[PDB]
Structure formats: structure tokens, C-alpha cells
């Protein structure tokens, strides 16, 4: 019927650093897809993040999307950060790399394709998908099997 993929993510970790994981729900098409992946050391936001790339980056062709998520991070970066970062490099004030460069630009990469509409969940108020993403995710960091490379402590 081809239709608007909806998606979905969602974080979590022990710690920081500690084991994480991330929940990804998509429905493309008619179908349910569900990614989910647990890491040795990481972060929180890099959870955050990771989910909502590893869904986006799954679509080989350009549709109209619907991500909800209760990232505040994700949310901050997106209402807030992200544009006055490119138009400035990437880097703070003080001209060292964003946190989370890896994360955000692999992100943006993804992002810039799509017609992505936004859907912040806040009171949790926000669906049982959303909740299945918090189970996902929580599971997965307990027992992690990947390494978050990309982490870097301090920067």
C-alpha cells in the first residue's frame, strides 16, 4: 500500500561508560523489523543515537518517515544542535569535535535523505512500541556483544 515507515527507538545503558544496548522497531511496508544490539563500553546518548541511525540507515530508497523517541539528547541535537554545528565544522567554541561526531555526522547521513517527521515522547506518554524498544535495549546491554569503537573518553 506503500504508506510512511514508522519508527521507532529507544537506549539504555548501565553506567557511563558501561553495557548498553538499543530497541529499533520499524515498519516498513506492512512488515516489523526489530534491531537490537548490546555494547561492551559506551554511553547513554550514544544508544540513544546508534538506534535511530541503524533503523534509518536500513532504507535503500527515500521515504516518508515517523520517528518517535524519548532521547532528549536525539531531540536537542535535532531541534537545537545539528544545523549550527555543519555551519561551523563540527567543533565547539574552543575548535575541538563535537561529542558524539562519529554518531551525529553518520546520523545526518541518514537523515539528509529521508523526509523523517518528528515524534517526542514525553510523560512516557508515548506507545507500547516505545516500550518494547526500553525492554529491547535493556536486555541487549545485558549481554553486549560489540564494541562502541567510536567511544572516546573525554573530547
Same mark, same amino acid.
Given at each position: @500500500?506503500?504508506?510512511?515507515?514508522?519508527?521507532?527507538?529507544?537506549?539504555?545503558?548501565?553506567?557511563?561508560? %558501561?553495557?548498553? %544496548?538499543? %530497541?529499533?522497531?520499524?515498519? =516498513?511496508?506492512?512488515?516489523?523489523? !526489530?534491531?537490537?544490539? %548490546? =555494547?561492551?563500553?559506551? !554511553?547513554?546518548?550514544? @544508544?540513544?543515537? @546508534?538506534?535511530?541511525?541503524?533503523?534509518?540507515?536500513?532504507?535503500?530508497?527515500?521515504?516518508?518517515?515517523?520517528?518517535?523517541?524519548?532521547?532528549? =539528547?536525539?531531540?536537542?541535537?535535532?531541534?537545537?544542535?545539528?544545523?549550527?554545528? /555543519? /555551519?561551523?565544522?563540527?567543533? !565547539?567554541?574552543?575548535?575541538?569535535?563535537?561529542?558524539?561526531?562519529?554518531?551525529?555526522?553518520?546520523?545526518?547521513?541518514?537523515?539528509?535523505?529521508?523526509?523523517?517527521?518528528?515524534?517526542?515522547? /514525553?510523560?512516557?506518554?508515548?506507545?507500547?512500541?516505545?516500550?518494547?524498544?526500553?525492554?529491547?535495549?535493556?536486555?541487549?546491554? @545485558?549481554?553486549? !556483544?560489540?564494541?562502541?569503537?567510536?567511544?572516546?573518553?573525554?573530547?
Amino acid at each position: @500500500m506503500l504508506k510512511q515507515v514508522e519508527i521507532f527507538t529507544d537506549g539504555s545503558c548501565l553506567g557511563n561508560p %558501561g553495557p548498553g %544496548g538499543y %530497541g529499533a522497531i520499524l515498519r =516498513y511496508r506492512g512488515r516489523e523489523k !526489530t534491531f537490537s544490539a %548490546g =555494547y561492551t563500553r559506551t !554511553t547513554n546518548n550514544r @544508544m540513544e543515537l @546508534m538506534a535511530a541511525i541503524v533503523a534509518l540507515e536500513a532504507l535503500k530508497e527515500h521515504c516518508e518517515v515517523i520517528l518517535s523517541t524519548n532521547s532528549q =539528547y536525539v531531540r536537542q541535537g535535532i531541534t537545537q544542535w545539528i544545523h549550527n554545528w /555543519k /555551519k561551523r565544522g563540527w567543533k !565547539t567554541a574552543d575548535k575541538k569535535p563535537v561529542k558524539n561526531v562519529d554518531l551525529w555526522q553518520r546520523l545526518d547521513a541518514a537523515l539528509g535523505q529521508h523526509q523523517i517527521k518528528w515524534e517526542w515522547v /514525553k510523560g512516557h506518554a508515548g506507545h507500547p512500541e516505545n516500550e518494547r524498544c526500553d525492554e529491547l535495549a535493556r536486555a541487549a546491554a @545485558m549481554n553486549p !556483544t560489540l564494541e562502541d569503537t567510536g567511544y572516546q573518553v573525554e573530547v
